[PDB]
Design a binder for this molecule. Structure first.
Ligand SMILES: *[C@@H]1O[C@H](CO)[C@@H](O)[C@H](O)[C@H]1NC(C)=O
Ligand SMILES: *[C@@H]1O[C@H](CO)[C@@H](O)[C@H](O)[C@H]1NC(C)=O
Ligand SMILES: *[C@@H]1O[C@H](CO)[C@@H](O)[C@H](O)[C@H]1NC(C)=O
Lengths: 137, 137, 137
């Protein structure tokens, strides 16, 4: 129906991963700046496509020193589409960043999963946003 | 009025920060590749939203070795929305990168500020662009 | 004609650069996830603008340890518009990332070129996507 669809969420705290997050390995975002269409489930940090079309996605997952290197991936219905990486050192914060355009059908689910390493020490300043570029008949 | 709004600017030189830039901590971009709507003030390196809607922003701030780590932030009317970080070493250039979708009202101002560290040694190859995803009634 | 234009391609293998890639220094993407309008030449990894308008581009070129630092650039008809950099170490994968909005005329060619260093060891997980923001009369 609506051709105006976009979401944007950020991690605004250094707080540690939850017990459920330790299980699902899905990255949570507490603050949702944008959510037109209400298609982003903030409770599960997942975007569900309301219709067929081309969707844009971008993420930047920031971490601190924690004796661990990480690999983040954008999951599409349980399968990784793109991935990003970050090293580990006590000099500065570093980010695993990537973006992509993909075709999603109505009901397709998009979310970020931590494939390697952990986010102990928090992942403040992390970002995850997306929008509908255009629908498809 | 116009639903076609986008800007794109780059730093095309290794030249040092200005005296005024040393005061405002705002990151300047000398070369403006795109500026449809003329809503980007190149003199102040700030984007002023012409109307209510969802806007996309992306930036990549590149630096060189200068004994300093930096923190860059996208400011919305003086308040930081998102941030990015870069270490410091004499091996290669590195970039503080991030992006986000946000809702802006008519008159809202968007720009990049250097919250920590300095850009002594220039910040060539740096980028800052944005566009109107869609307006809101 | 069509105002719906977007492409998205990824590198899905650690395989080494080809003999022809060693000559052109152009970065190849074997898997094309999106190609609405069919304006992206997968054989040459180049996007040809079908009409006048503002186009968005984003790329993330991932590499491994190979005793080499790299510089990647988005070429517009043989000239670099933006650039990105990545160091070199055996700790983790790292990415040269950047994005930009640019005005392209009908026939203008956009592609990624490796200006410095090599991608020996493969460039798996690399991404390159773009879309038409809006056309211009
Ligand atoms: C999650 O796992 C880490 C180990 O990687 C552990 O230190 C932490 O306490 C766990 N968090 C919870 C809430 O159980
Ligand atoms: C800006 O401040 C730096 C110190 O961080 C100084 O070295 C530089 O000369 C200053 N630039 C100007 C134009 O005053
Ligand atoms: C490309 O050049 C590298 C040297 O940088 C060489 O090791 C490699 O074998 C070359 N690839 C081909 C296919 O010739």
């Amino acid at each position: 129906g609506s051709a105006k669809v976009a979401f944007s969420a950020i991690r605004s705290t250094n707080h540690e991963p939850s017990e459920m997050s330790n299980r699902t390995m899905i990255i949570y975002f507490d603050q949702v700046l944008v959510n037109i269409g209400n298609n982003f489930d903030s409770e599960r940090s997942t975007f569900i496509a309301p219709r067929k079309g081309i969707y844009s996605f971008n993420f930047h997952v920031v971490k601190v020193y924690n004796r661990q290197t990480i690999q983040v991936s954008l999951m599409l219905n349980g399968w990784p589409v793109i991935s990003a990486f970050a090293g580990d050192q006590d000099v500065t914060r570093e980010a695993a960043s990537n973006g992509v355009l993909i075709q999603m059908e109505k009901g397709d689910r998009a979310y970020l999963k931590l494939e390697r390493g952990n986010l102990m020490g928090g992942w403040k300043y992390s970002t995850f946003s997306g929008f509908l570029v255009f629908p498809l008949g």
